[PDB]
Amino acid sequence: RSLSFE
Amino acid sequence: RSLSFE
Amino acid sequence: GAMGSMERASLIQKAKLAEQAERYEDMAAFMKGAVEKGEELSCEERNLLSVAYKNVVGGQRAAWRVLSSIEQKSNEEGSEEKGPEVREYREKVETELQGVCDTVLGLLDSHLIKEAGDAESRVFYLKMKGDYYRYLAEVATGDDKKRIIDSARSAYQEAMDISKKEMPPTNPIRLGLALNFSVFHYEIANSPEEAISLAKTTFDEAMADLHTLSEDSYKDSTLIMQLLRDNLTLWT
Amino acid sequence: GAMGSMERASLIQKAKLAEQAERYEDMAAFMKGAVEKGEELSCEERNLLSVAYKNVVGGQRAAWRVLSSIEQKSNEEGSEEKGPEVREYREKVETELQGVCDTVLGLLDSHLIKEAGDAESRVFYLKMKGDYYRYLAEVATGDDKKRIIDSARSAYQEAMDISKKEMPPTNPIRLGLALNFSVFHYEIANSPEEAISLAKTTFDEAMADLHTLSEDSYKDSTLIMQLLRDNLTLWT
Ligand SMILES: [Mg+2]
Ligand SMILES: [Mg+2]
Ligand SMILES: [Mg+2]
Ligand SMILES: [Mg+2]
Ligand SMILES: [Mg+2]
Ligand SMILES: [Mg+2]
């Protein structure tokens, strides 16, 4: 669920 | 935009 | 065939896994492999076949429409020439779509339709044949546009005649066939009045048969009837 | 290479068309062809390269996770044996993902990184190298899990040292690098405290530099800072 660079 | 059988 | 060494049951199991993974190209390849085993398909297996290719061709149709619109704008008054690339890339996607449609139609002709004796299987496959000739027709422009359209119409009509004789008006495959034939009339055959009449008559006859259904079947049929209604609202 | 006969400009034009069509496998193939022309890539072209492969590997990672979860449940207490199919199909998707990661890493090594002299290009490509070793690490289990992890860490660290020396704290590529290195720490390296410290320090230093920016750059930087914030909220 960690967000990375879009 | 006509809808067909899903 | 690349799937020739895999067990039929394994191909079906993997088609279901690929659906869960949203891997529809894989799903289609697995179900093609399953069909080429030569045995008839169960109701669930027919549905898996349909979901796989519908999603594959669905992405191709969505891309072709995006590109065809860019290409059309490119040929408007005042548009700067950008060279052959838009047409080339539209043609590439178009060719890939046509190949998927041809693959499905070849499976139906070798030998799904001819072995389909029950009304539910025969109607399902004839509907499918109409559908994939309809997708071909969406992109057709040359000498065979008319023959492609008539191949779609012919398949849908044979399926309708069987469905009317053999299936209740609320049967989900009968309903989806009539829905899709009405879309054919509206979007392909330049016959919006035929489209509207078919959608209305289909809806009304199904409405009058709902009282015979269980709660689960009621839900299945009304879901499809709502698509007929939505189209009628768009079309009128 | 299948793209060797196509002009570089045509490949870039078609990569942009494929993006509009959401045809990311095509987009990646076009940008691979463009890179293999041997010239350096502009800022916009680097972004196109990144979008294409991010979307391709993104779909593969999402499928692998679905399948790996099914496989894990299959090996729980009380689960009925279903044969080798789940593992087989997980392995197929895994192998395809690894091949995409290898393709990207090969482009960086031949010869994007070595010709990247400016800070913006060198940092972009070293970040990319960390990212695609990180995706390899998500699925790694055997003798080289540790070496894959260290290859990711090494690439990200070299990129961070350059970014800190050469770029302002709000530079979007510096911010995205720090974001992704913090995800590496949290999800790959079992170092949640390092992840949190990096995300906090990155956010705070960017906050203090926002006053130097235009309204457009302010918007670009704050959008990425919000991802750092969202992660910190999830992680603490
Ligand atoms: Mg039979
Ligand atoms: Mg009957
Ligand atoms: Mg009639
Ligand atoms: Mg240089
Ligand atoms: Mg600088
Ligand atoms: Mg530090």
Q: Assign 3-class secondary structure to B1-6.
A: CCCCCC
Residues sharing a CB contact under 8 Å with residue D186, sequence separation 6 or more, in sequence order: A2, D192, D195, D196, D231, D235
C-D CB pairs within 8 A amount to 60
What distance in angstroms lies between residue C135's CA and the mean position of ligand 6's atoms?
57
* Alpha-carbon gap, residue C44 to C206, rounded angstroms: 23
Q: Do A5 and D227 touch (CB under 8 A)?
A: yes
* Alpha-carbon gap, residue D169 to D162, rounded angstroms: 12
What distance in angstroms lies between residue A6's CA and the mean position of ligand 5's atoms?
23
| Residue/partner pairs of C150-159 with CB below 8 Å, 24 or more apart | C152/C184, C152/C188, C153/C184, C153/C189, C155/C126, C155/C127, C155/C129, C155/C130, C156/C126, C156/C127, C156/C130, C156/C180, C156/C181, C156/C184, C157/C181, C158/C126, C159/C122, C159/C123, C159/C126, C159/C127, C159/C130
- CB atoms < 10 A from the CB of C217, how many? 15
Q: In Å, how far are C3, C13, C75, C108, D19 from C6, measured between CA atoms?
A: 6, 11, 49, 21, 35
SS3 category, D117: coil
| Cα angle: D48, vertex D54, D56; to 5 degrees | 105
Pick from C180, C224, C234: which is nearest to B1 by CB?
C234
* Alpha-carbon gap, residue D125 to D109, rounded angstroms: 10
What distance in angstroms lies between residue C171's CA and the mean position of ligand 2's atoms?
9
Q: Which residues of D touch A5 (CB under 8 A)?
A: 175-177, 179-180, 224, 227
Q: Of how many residues is chain A composed?
A: 6
Buried b (16+ CB within 10 A) or exposed e, C79-113: eeeeeebbbebbebbbebbeebbebbbebbeeebb
- Rounded to the nearest angstrom, the minimum Cα separation between D111 and chain C is 27
Pick from D131, D176, D187: which is nearest to A2 by CB?
D187
Q: How far does CA C112 lie from the centroid of its chain?
A: 16
SS3 category, C144: coil
Q: In the block, which residue shows the tokens 């390849």?
A: C29
**C106 located within any domain:** yes
Pick from C14, C18, C63: which is nearest to D23 by CB?
C63
Q: In Å, how far are C188, D21, D22 from D25, measured between CA atoms?
A: 30, 11, 9
* Alpha-carbon gap, residue D228 to D222, rounded angstroms: 10
Closest residue by Cα to residue D90 from D58, D73, D74, D66: D66
* Alpha-carbon gap, residue C70 to C64, rounded angstroms: 10
Start-to-end Cα distance in chain C: 48
Mutual angle of helices D85-107 and D43-74, in 10-degree steps: 160
Q: Do D234 and A6 touch (CB under 8 A)?
A: no
D53 touches chain A (CB under 8 A): no
Contact D160, D181 (CB under 8 A): yes
Structure tokens at D60: 């593969």
Contact D212, D220 (CB under 8 A): no
Domain that holds residue C212: 8-235
- Which helix (H) or strand (E) segment holds residue C149: the answer is helix C145-166
Query: Can you list the alpha helix ranges (DSSP code H) found in chain D?
Result: 8-20, 24-35, 43-74, 85-107, 113-115, 119-139, 145-166, 172-183, 192-207, 215-235
* Alpha-carbon gap, residue C206 to C202, rounded angstroms: 6
Contact D81, D70 (CB under 8 A): no
Buried b (16+ CB within 10 A) or exposed e, C129-150: bbbbbbbbbbbbeeeeeeebbe
**D139 located within any domain:** yes
Q: Do A3 and D179 touch (CB under 8 A)?
A: yes
Residue of D nearest to C83 (CA): D10
C151 touches chain B (CB under 8 A): no
Closest residue by Cα to residue C112 from C67, C45, C57, C210: C45
Number of domains forming the structure of chain C: 1
Closest residue by Cα to residue D36 from D23, D24, D25, D45: D45
**C14 located within any domain:** yes
**D47 located within any domain:** yes
**D126 located within any domain:** yes
Contact D125, D141 (CB under 8 A): no
**C3 located within any domain:** no
Contact D231, D199 (CB under 8 A): yes
Contact C140, C192 (CB under 8 A): no
Residues from A contacting D (CB-CB < 8 Å) are 1-6
- Which helix (H) or strand (E) segment holds residue C63: the answer is helix C43-74
- Rounded to the nearest angstrom, the minimum Cα separation between D128 and chain A is 11
Q: How was this structure determined?
A: X-ray
Residue type, C8: R
CA torsion angle C98 C101 C106 C108 (round to 10): -160
* Alpha-carbon gap, residue C217 to C74, rounded angstroms: 49
D80 touches chain C (CB under 8 A): no
Q: Do A1 and D234 touch (CB under 8 A)?
A: yes
- Which helix (H) or strand (E) segment holds residue C179: the answer is helix C172-183
Which chains have at least 3 CB atom pairs separated by less than 8 Å from chain C? B, D
Tell me, what CATH number does C147's domain have? 1.20.190.20
Q: Which residues of D touch A1 (CB under 8 A)?
A: 234
Closest residue by Cα to residue D172 from D105, D233, D219: D219
Declared resolution, Å:
1.9
Q: Is C93 left (phi over 0), alpha (psi -120 to 50) or beta?
A: alpha
Instruction: Provide DSSP, C72-133.
Output: HHHTSTTPPP--SHHHHHHHHHHHHHHHHHHHHHHHIIIIIHHH--SHHHHHHHHHHHHHHH
Pick from D179, D234, D235: which is nearest to A4 by CB?
D179
Q: Is the peptide bond before C211 cis (omega within 30 degrees of 0)?
A: no
Chains A and D touch (3+ CB pairs under 8 A): yes
Q: Do D180 and A3 touch (CB under 8 A)?
A: no
DSSP state, residue A3: -
**C121 located within any domain:** yes
Buried b (16+ CB within 10 A) or exposed e, A1-6: ebbbbe
**D3 located within any domain:** no
Residue of A nearest to D55 (CA): A6
Residue type, D89: Y
D93 touches chain C (CB under 8 A): yes
- Rounded to the nearest angstrom, the minimum Cα separation between D33 and chain C is 15
- CB atoms < 10 A from the CB of D187, how many? 17
* Alpha-carbon gap, residue C214 to C1, rounded angstroms: 43
